[PDB]
Amino acid sequence: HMKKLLVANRGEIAVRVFRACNELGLSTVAVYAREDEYSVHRFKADESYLIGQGKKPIDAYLDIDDIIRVALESGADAIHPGYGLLSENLE
Amino acid sequence: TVNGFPGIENTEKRHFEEPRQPLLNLEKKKTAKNILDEQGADAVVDYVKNTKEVLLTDTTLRDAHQSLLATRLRLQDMKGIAQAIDQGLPELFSAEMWGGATFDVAYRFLNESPWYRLRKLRKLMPNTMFQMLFRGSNAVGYQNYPDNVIEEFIRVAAHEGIDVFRIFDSLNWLPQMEKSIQAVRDNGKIAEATICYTGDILDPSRPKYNIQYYKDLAKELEATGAHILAVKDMAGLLKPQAAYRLISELKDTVDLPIHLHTHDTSGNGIITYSGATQAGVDIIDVATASLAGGTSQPSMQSIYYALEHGPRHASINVKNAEQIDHYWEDVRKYYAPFEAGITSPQTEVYMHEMPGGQYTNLKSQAAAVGLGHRFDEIKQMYRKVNMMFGDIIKVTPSSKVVGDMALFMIQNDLTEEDVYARGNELNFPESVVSFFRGDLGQPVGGFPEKLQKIIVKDKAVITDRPGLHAEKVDFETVKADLEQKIGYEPGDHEVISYIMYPQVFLDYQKMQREFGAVTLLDTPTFLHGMRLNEKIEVQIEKGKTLSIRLDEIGEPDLAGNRVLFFNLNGQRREVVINDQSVQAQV
Amino acid sequence: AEATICYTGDILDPSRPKYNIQYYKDLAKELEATGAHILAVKDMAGLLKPQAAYRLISELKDTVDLPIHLHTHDTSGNGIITYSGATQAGVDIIDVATASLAGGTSQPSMQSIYYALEHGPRHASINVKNAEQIDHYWEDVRKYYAPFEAGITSPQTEVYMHEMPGGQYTNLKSQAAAVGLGHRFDEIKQM
Numbered sequence: 001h002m003k004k005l006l007v008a009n010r011g012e013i014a015v016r017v018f019r020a021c022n023e024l025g026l027s028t029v030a031v032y033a034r035e036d037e038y039s040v041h042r043f044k045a046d047e048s049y050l051i052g053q054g055k056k057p058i059d060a061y062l063d064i065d066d067i068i069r070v071a072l073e074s075g076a077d078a079i080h081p082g083y084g085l086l087s088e089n090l091e
Numbered sequence: 092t093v094n095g096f097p098g099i100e101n102t103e104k105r106h107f108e109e110p111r112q113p114l115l116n117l118e119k120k121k122t123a124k125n126i127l128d129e130q131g132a133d134a135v136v137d138y139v140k141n142t143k144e145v146l147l148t149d150t151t152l153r154d155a156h157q158s159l160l161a162t163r164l165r166l167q168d169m170k171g172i173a174q175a176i177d178q179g180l181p182e183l184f185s186a187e188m189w190g191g192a193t194f195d196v197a198y199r200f201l202n203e204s205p206w207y208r209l210r211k212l213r214k215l216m217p218n219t220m221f222q223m224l225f226r227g228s229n230a231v232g233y234q235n236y237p238d239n240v241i242e243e244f245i246r247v248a249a250h251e252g253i254d255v256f257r258i259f260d261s262l263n264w265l266p267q268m269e270k271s272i273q274a275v276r277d278n279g280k281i282a283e284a285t286i287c288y289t290g291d292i293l294d295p296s297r298p299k300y301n302i303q304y305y306k307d308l309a310k311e312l313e314a315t316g317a318h319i320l321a322v323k324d325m326a327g328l329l330k331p332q333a334a335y336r337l338i339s340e341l342k343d344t345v346d347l348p349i350h351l352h353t354h355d356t357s358g359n360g361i362i363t364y365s366g367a368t369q370a371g372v373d374i375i376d377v378a379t380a381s382l383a384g385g386t387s388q389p390s391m392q393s394i395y396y397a398l399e400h401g402p403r404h405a406s407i408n409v410k411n412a413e414q415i416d417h418y419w420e421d422v423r424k425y426y427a428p429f430e431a432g433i434t435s436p437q438t439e440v441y442m443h444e445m446p447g448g449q450y451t452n453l454k455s456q457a458a459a460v461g462l463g464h465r466f467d468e469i470k471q472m473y474r475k476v477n478m479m480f481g482d483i484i485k486v487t488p489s490s491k492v493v494g495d496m497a498l499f500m501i502q503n504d505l506t507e508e509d510v511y512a513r514g515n516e517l518n519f520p521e522s523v524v525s526f527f528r529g530d531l532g533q534p535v536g537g538f539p540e541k542l543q544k545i546i547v548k549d550k551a552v553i554t555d556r557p558g559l560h561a562e563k564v565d566f567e568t569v570k571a572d573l574e575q576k577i578g579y580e581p582g583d584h585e586v587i588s589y590i591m592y593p594q595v596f597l598d599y600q601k602m603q604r605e606f607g608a609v610t611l612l613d614t615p616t617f618l619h620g621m622r623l624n625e626k627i628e629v630q631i632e633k634g635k636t637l638s639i640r641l642d643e644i645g646e647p648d649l650a651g652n653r654v655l656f657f658n659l660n661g662q663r664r665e666v667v668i669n670d671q672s673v674q675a676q677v
Numbered sequence: 678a679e680a681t682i683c684y685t686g687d688i689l690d691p692s693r694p695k696y697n698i699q700y701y702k703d704l705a706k707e708l709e710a711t712g713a714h715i716l717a718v719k720d721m722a723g724l725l726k727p728q729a730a731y732r733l734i735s736e737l738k739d740t741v742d743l744p745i746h747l748h749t750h751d752t753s754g755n756g757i758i759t760y761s762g763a764t765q766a767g768v769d770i771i772d773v774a775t776a777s778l779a780g781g782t783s784q785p786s787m788q789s790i791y792y793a794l795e796h797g798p799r800h801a802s803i804n805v806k807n808a809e810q811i812d813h814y815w816e817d818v819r820k821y822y823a824p825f826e827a828g829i830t831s832p833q834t835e836v837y838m839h840e841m842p843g844g845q846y847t848n849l850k851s852q853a854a855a856v857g858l859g860h861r862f863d864e865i866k867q868m
C-alpha cells in the first residue's frame with residue numbers, strides 16, 4: 001500500500017496534489033530547484049529536497065534521475081508528475 | 092542578534108567558509124567495538140593484550156575541547172566529522188566523547204542534551220567504541236549520589252551507547268569506585284579502573300605517592316575485576332623516566348592492560364607517551380593535532396611519527412587523521428570567543444600541579460574578582476595550600492577545593508600559621524568544609540587532624556563512604572514530579588539528568604520551550620545570531636529546511652522592544668524582541 | 678667554526694634515497710676535512726624524526742670525532758623527543774628556546790627538555806629554576822608583540838609533507854593572502 005507520495009512538479013499543481021494526498025492520509029515529498037527555494041509548494045509538504053543542483057531550474061525540474069533518486073531515498077512509494085514538465089514523458 | 096550570546100563579548104558575525112571535508116582512504120577492518128558487540132568485554136581485553144602496537148583513544152570529542160575551548164564544542168561540528176572519524180580511523184580503540192564537564196556544560200551553556208549528543212554520535216559512529224569519564228560515586232555531578240542513582244546512570248549510559256567507563260575517584264579511594272565498576276561489569280561493558288597520578292615517583296623528597304603506593308593501588312584495582320587499568324595524569328605531571336618506571340612496575344604487578352591519559356601542559360606529553368610505550372603500555376589518550384598541545388592531549392599525528400620506526404608503532408591511519416585535522420582546524424575558528432590564552436610549554440605545572448581545566452576555570456573566576464592581577468601569588472598559594480592539606484590528589488572536584496581554599500587565603504591576606512591561629516572564627520568556603528567533613532571521601536593518610544577540627548567546627552564529619560549516608564531516591568516519585576514539571580512523561584535518561592542536575596535540567600527545559608532545539612544551528616549563527624541581509628538554512632528535520640533571512644532590524648521603541656524583519660520560508664515575519672541595553676518605560 | 682649540515686628528506690625512509698645516511702656521513706667527513714670545530718646538524722623545518730635522530734647522530738658520532746650540535750624546530754610537535762633521541766645517541770649541544778617563546782615553529786623549550794632528560798643517563802646542563810624565573814620576563818615581553826603573533830599554533834605534521842621551514846611558512850602565507858590566494862593556500866602547500 002502507498003504511504004508516501006512525491007510530486008515531480010512545482011507551484012499550484014504540487015500544492016493541489018499535496019492537499020489531495022493529505023486528504024487521503026498520505027505523506028508528501030516536494031522537490032524544488034535552487035531558484036524555486038521560495039516557492040509555496042516546498043513548504044506545503046512534509047519533506048522537501050533540492051533537485052538539479054547546478055543546472056537551469058527548468059532543466060532541474062526535468063531531471064529524471066535526480067527526481068527518482070530523491071523519491072527512492074525519501075521512502076516515497078509513488079510519483080505524481082502533475083502537468084507540463086514530465087507528465088507526458090514516456091522515459 | 093540584539094542582545095548577544097551571554098558570557099562572551101558581542102562581535103559581528105564573521106564570514107566563515109565551509110570546513111574542509113577529508114579525502115579518506117577507507118580500509119574496512121574489525122574494530123574493538125565489533126569485538127565487544129559480538130564477543131564481550133573479555134575478548135576486547137584479550138584483543139588489546141594481543142596487539143603489539145600501541146592503541147590510541149581519541150580525546151578530541153571530550154577532553155581536547157574541555158582543555159582548550161572550555162568544553163564549548165557543539166554537536167553540529169561533532170556530527171560534521173563523526174562519520175569520517177568512524178570510517179577513516181577504524182584503528183582507534185575508543186573515542187572519548189562523554190563525561191566530565193561535558194554533561195553539565197552542554198545543558199548549562201550549549202542548551203543541548205548530552206544524551207541527544209550521545210544518541211546522534213552513536214548513530215553516526217556505529218563501529219567506534221564510546222568512552223565516558225566516570226567520576227566515581229559522583230558520576231557527572233559534584234555532590235555525592237546514592238548507589239541506585241549510579242547504577243541507573245550506568246545502565247542508561249550503557250544502553251544508549253557508552254562502551255568504556257573510565258571510573259576514577261577524586262582521592263583514589265576504592266570504596267567510591269568498586270560499586271560503579273561492578274555495575275559497569277554487570278551491564279556488559281568495559282570498566283576502566285583509574286589511578287590519578289600525582290607528585291613524582293622518582294623524587295625521594297615526596298614519598299607519600301611512591302611506586303609501592305601505585306603498585307598496591309593497582310593490585311586492589313585488579314582485585315575488583317575491572318577490565319582495564321587506567322592511569323590518569325591530570326596535570327601532565329608524569330615525567331618520561333617516571334612514566335617508564337611506573338608503567339614497568341604496573342606491568343609486572345597486574346595482568347590488566349594499561350591505559351595512559353596525560354596532558355601536554357609541560358610540553359613533555361609525546362616523550363612521556365613514548366616512554367610508556369617502551370615500557371609496554373597498551374592504549375594512550377591522544378587528540379587531533381588542531382586541538383592538541385597546551386592543556387590538551389598530545390597529537391595523534393605527532394605520536395604516529397614519534398614511534399614510526401621504533402620497536403612499537405602506533406595503530407592509526409595518519410593520512411586519514413591528517414585529513415580530519417583539516418576539518419578540526421577549520422571548525423576551531425568558530426570558537427574564538429572561548430579560546431584560552433596564548434599556548435606555551437608550561438613547566439611550572441610541576442610546582443602547583445593545577446589541572447588545565449581547573450587552571451583556566453580558576454583564572455576566569457579570579458579574573459571576575461579584582462584580585463586577579465597576582466595570579467602568580469594565587470598559584471603559589473595553591474601549591475602551599477596543597478602542601479598544607481596533606482598533599483591531596485588535585486582533580487575534579489578536589490582540585491576545586493584547593494583552588495577555592497587558596498583563593499580564600501590570598502583574598503583576605505591569610506597565611507598557614509595565621510589560618511591555624513584564626514581558624515576558629517574564620518568562615519571558610521563551602522568546598523573546604525565539605526571536603527574536610529568527608530563528603531568527597533577519605534584521603535590517603537587522612538585529614539590533618541588539627542586542621543580538620545579548625546576547618547569544620549560544629550558540623551558532623553563522616554569517615555565512611557558518603558554514598559552510604561545519601562538520602563534514598565525513588566525513581567517513580569521523581570519521574571512523576573518531573574512529568575508534572577516538564578509537562579510530558581520523561582525517559583529514564585531525563586529522570587537521571589533531573590536527579591543529578593535538578594535546576595540545570597529544568598532551566599534547559601525552559602530554554603527548550605522558549606528557543607527550541609538550538610543545537611541544530613551552526614556555531615557562528617549559534618554564537619553571533621544573524622547578520623543584516625544574511626541568508627542561513629536551518630535543517631530542523633530530514634527533508635525540512637528553514638530558510639531564514641534577516642532583512643532589517645528595527646529601532647527600539649519606548650518600551651525597549653525591537654522589531655526584526657525576518658523572511659522565514661519566503662514570507663515576511665516580524666519578530667518582537669526586547670533589547671536589554673535599552674531602558675524600558677521611557 | 679660550526680660547519681652545518683642541512684637536513685632534508687628522511688634517512689629511515691627508503692623511497693627517498695638521495696639524502697640517505699651515507700650522504701650525511703660523506704658530508705660530515707668532508708666537513709671534518711676542513712678545520713671546523715663542531716659539526717652542526719640544521720633541521721630548519723623540523724623534519725628529523727626521533728628514530729631518525731637517534732640513527733643519524735649515532736652514524737655521525739662514529740664517523741667523525743667533532744662534537745655534534747643539533748638544531749631543530751617542533752613544528753610537528755616532536756622536537757623534545759627528537760632531542761631526547763639524539764641525547765641517547767650521544768649528541769653534545771642542542772638548540773633550545775625559553776618556554777614562553779617555544780613551541781610551534783620555534784625551538785623546543787629549554788625548561789621542558791630538562792624535565793624530559795631528568796633522571797636519565799644524561800641530564801641537561803641548565804639551572805631550570807633560574808630558567809623558569811627568566812621565562813616570566815619573556816612571557817610579559819611577548820605581550821608587547823601582539824601585532825606580530827603568528828596566530829593559533831598547533832603541532833603540524835604536514836611539515837613532513839611540504840618541508841616548508843617556519844620562516845618560509847609565515848612569509849609565503851602573507852604574500853598569498855596579499856595577492857589573493859590565501860583561501861587556496863592548501864593547494865599552494867600541495868604544489
Ligand SMILES: *C(=O)CCCC[C@@H]1SC[C@@H]2NC(=O)N[C@@H]21
Nearest residue numbers: 009010011058061083084085086
Ligand atoms: C513549465 O514548464 C511548467 C509547465 C507550464 C506549461 C504547461 S504546458 C501544458 C500545461 N498547460 C498550461 O497552461 N501549462 C502547462
Ligand SMILES: [Mg+2]
Nearest residue numbers: 139140142373
Ligand atoms: Mg597491547
Ligand SMILES: [Mn+2]
Nearest residue numbers: 154324325352
Ligand atoms: Mn584529562
Ligand SMILES: [Mn+2]
Nearest residue numbers: 720721748750
Ligand atoms: Mn632555525
